[PDB]
Amino acid sequence: PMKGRFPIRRTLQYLSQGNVVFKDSVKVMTVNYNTHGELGEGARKFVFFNIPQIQYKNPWVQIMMFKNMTPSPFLRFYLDSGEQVLVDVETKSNKEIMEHIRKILGKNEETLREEEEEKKQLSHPANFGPRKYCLRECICEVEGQVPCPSLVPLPKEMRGKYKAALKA
Amino acid sequence: KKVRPRLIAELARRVRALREQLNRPRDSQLYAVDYETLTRPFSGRRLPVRAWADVRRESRLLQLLGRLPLFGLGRLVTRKSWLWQHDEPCYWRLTRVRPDYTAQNLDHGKAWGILTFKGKTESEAREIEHVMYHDWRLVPKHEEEAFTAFTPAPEDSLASVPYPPLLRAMIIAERQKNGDTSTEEPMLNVQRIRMEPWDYPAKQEDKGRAKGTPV
Amino acid sequence: LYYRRAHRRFVTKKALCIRVFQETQKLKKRRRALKAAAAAQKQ
């Protein structure tokens, strides 16, 4: 079987289920958490389960984690303007910590929808070319248009070999 | 990532640029012509067939100015190609002339002046082009007043042209879609576009020059 | 930072490399005074 406890975390499906896409301001995220104590279980679960999902959706945001430096767990976000957002996460569950940062620093669902629609316009249905980029390679594929000579040979009158023979 | 320097590529580049400045050919060599074969001996290239006639019959600009006190400063010089084409007086008022001293007859060089194309005088003097062409003609002093006599015709010209069929239909549809109800015809303002003739003197300052390779 | 044995060849080479650097540094400075002297003469 797959190695490690909770191997689901090492699957593209699980890594793409994160709902936190930070706004462009967020640059660094420092996760200070304690390895022991009941009040820090959520922070430990948040580091175990959710940091992979956050990093996958925000590849260019630096996530750095510090163990047992302070009596209580907290998050700190460093924004491009220079503002620092301290989020105390003590007593909160890993689900609550995740929802809290989506609200204050996550792009809303409308902002994300728009970006996806802008991507749709990059591929034009009418454009012809290689299959990697376009739906159809040649107009000959469109029914009604003169088929490809490779499939349906053209009439002798339309072929240059015999066009110049009739003339000369 | 540290690119290995190419020193010989920079040395030769500097040497070439220098030699191009010290061994540069003069206008006497570049713009010479053999009047029998009608080929520039510098490059051995034939002139176009349409220029053969004027090359034999007409004089260059500094073939005429070399016979004047100060290379014809403040003197009007026209061109045959202009006289044949345009009725309005087209001429240069010469302001500066850099003669080519290497010519045995001082029949090459440069020239600056103020353009007056079709009776419209330019505000500033600029370098004259086609100085090497067999096309120029000197305006006699006693004929200057009559030659320059011009009456500006009325400038009445078309100001607005209709949009082409399709574009017109697309501008009218946007009006109706936005809600604006109007029956005015969309038209292109062509007043800004001042269409100059194809034989209008270009800017000689931005024109290039033939390279040094002699034949 | 690193835990690698310094065998004879390495120890000997590192001594020369330091000596060569020191002898080059001194040369860099003898091509500073000579240039300064020539510049002073032009005046």
């Binding site: 209580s72 503002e83 957002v85 301290l86 989020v87 105390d88 003590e90 007593t91 809290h100 609200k103 204050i104 620093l105 | - | -």
Partner: protein, 51 residues
Amino acid sequence: ELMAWNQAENRRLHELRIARLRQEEREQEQRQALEQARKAEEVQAWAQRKE
């Protein structure tokens, strides 16, 4: 607005922390008192042995 809301949440959590810390000291003081009593008896009994 979201940053102001986050700061308000942090302040609320801090008020809860102070309450929890106050209770823990009360329990600490109690445990300390018992330890000190036990220790004092041990020292006394041990001091008597050496005398």
